[PDB]
């Protein structure tokens, strides 16, 4: 070329790489510093954050506090363990986000032994609710939402998970502006379409809307809903009994697997002797090719 090579030797010599998770595009350190750092006059009082991460096929809800050697996770809930009871299809939606936030809330409260107190909002409605600490009793668990790189506009599944947790009984500071019920025009919160979103009524309306226009498009969209026959009329009761089962048993038990032979699926790193031998063989073969001409 005739243009200066921008990425020459000196460019790499002076290049400073960013943090590993910044390069991976996973952690916003500007938000993390404000989010995980405790006041110095609070010393070793942990600062709890509820990490919510919505995946292409899963929802991860975790509660963690920062330490020097790394974040310490005290409770984790996933949307892939929702099929253990109630909802089995249509995960990674708003209703499953509410369910997994509620499951995380109940599981953490059960681990800490605060269940009879801080029952949360058992009767589900979309209106705001904030648990209040009972005097003479252990205080309500307080954590702060970690949305990550998600765009926190109205109707986000991270706020669905937050609503699930605050209905489960955690004291998470929030507002109703980002719930799906909020009207950005009149600056008002409907608190009923939010309950519809929590119970998955929008998805059911989509199903019965697709049925009346394009049946094959309905099949293509809700293909797995057809399997095991999840229908719009029973979706809300499915979610209600899923919430009931979450409240009934939030304890997680692990799945054991140890009878696995130690098989390696990766190529090991070559040794220095092997690399030198490879270079020598390549030189010899090149000279052989020349002498054969």
């Amino acid at each position: 070329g005739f243009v200066k090579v921008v990425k020459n030797k000196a460019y790499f010599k002076r290049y400073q790489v960013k943090f590993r998770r910044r390069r991976e595009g996973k952690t916003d350190y500007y938000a993390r510093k404000r989010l995980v750092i405790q006041d110095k006059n609070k010393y070793n009082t942990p600062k709890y954050r509820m990490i919510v991460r919505v995946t292409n096929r899963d929802i991860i809800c975790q509660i963690a506090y920062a330490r020097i050697e790394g974040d310490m996770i005290v409770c984790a809930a996933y949307a892939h363990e929702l099929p253990k009871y109630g909802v089995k299809v249509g995960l990674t939606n708003y209703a499953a986000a509410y369910c997994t936030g509620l499951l995380l809330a109940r599981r953490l409260l059960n681990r800490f032994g605060m269940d009879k107190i801080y029952e949360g909002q058992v009767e589900v409605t979309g209106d705001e609710y904030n648990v209040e600490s009972i005097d003479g009793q252990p205080g309500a668990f307080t954590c702060y939402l970690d949305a990550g790189l998600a765009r926190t506009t109205t109707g986000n599944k991270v706020f669905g998970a937050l609503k699930g947790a605050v209905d489960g009984g955690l004291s998470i500071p929030h507002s109703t502006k980002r719930f799906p019920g909020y009207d950005s025009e009149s600056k008002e919160f409907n608190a009923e379409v939010h309950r519809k979103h929590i119970m998955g009524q929008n998805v059911a309306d989509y199903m019965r809307y697709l049925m009346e226009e394009d049946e094959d498009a309905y099949k293509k969209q809700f293909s797995q809903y057809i399997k095991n026959s999840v229908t719009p009329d029973m979706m809300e009761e499915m979610y209600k009994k899923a919430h009931a089962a979450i409240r009934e048993n939030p304890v997680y038990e692990k799945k054991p697997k140890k009878e696995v032979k130690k098989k390696r699926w990766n190529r090991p790193k070559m040794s220095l002797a092997q690399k030198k031998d490879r270079v020598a063989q390549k030189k010899a073969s090149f000279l052989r090719a020349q002498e054969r001409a």
Partner: protein, 170 residues
């Protein structure tokens, strides 16, 4: 034999009309683009002030709009019909996407209107493969990798197979 995830396809079409000045001419050009695309266009301010072209900084100069999907396919079809399905060898960039220009906007479908000029325009189609969106996504963005890229030769070949075009030795 060929992975279905490697198929070339049009990402955007990126129509652009660069009227020299602002005002009624620019408004009529915006009406032209909206009529052609069925889609509201946007204006472009002038980055600097140049006396030779007689434009001031922050003055609305051009109008443009990006079109994606089947509408992009149809608009590109009309533009190439006007171009007689022939393009110069140098009309293709080294990044795998290309473009051309149309002198009069009424020879492609749109009928003349007396309250509308004879505006010309620029087509610049951007090719792509499934998975190019990872360079634009917010969380865990990354580059596409060398084999997944599109070369000038591949763009020319795709033009020849799809629109049975002629690559003139320009």
């Amino acid at each position: 034999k060929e992975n279905p995830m490697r198929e070339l396809r049009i990402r955007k079409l990126c129509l652009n009309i660069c009227v020299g000045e602002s005002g009624d001419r620019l408004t009529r050009a915006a009406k032209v683009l909206e009529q052609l695309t069925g889609q509201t266009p946007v204006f472009s301010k002038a980055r600097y002030t140049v006396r030779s072209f007689g434009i001031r900084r922050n003055e609305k100069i051009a109008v443009h709009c990006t079109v994606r999907g089947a509408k992009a396919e149809e608009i590109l079809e009309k533009g190439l019909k006007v171009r007689e399905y022939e393009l110069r060898k140098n009309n293709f960039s080294d990044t795998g996407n290309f473009g051309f220009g149309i002198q009069e906007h009424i020879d492609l479908g749109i009928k003349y209107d007396p309250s509308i000029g004879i505006y010309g325009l620029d087509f610049y189609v951007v090719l792509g493969r499934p998975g190019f969106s990872i360079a634009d996504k917010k969380r865990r963005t990354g580059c596409i990798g060398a084999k997944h890229r599109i070369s000038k030769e591949e763009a020319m070949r795709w033009f020849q197979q799809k629109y049975d075009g002629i690559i003139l030795p320009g």
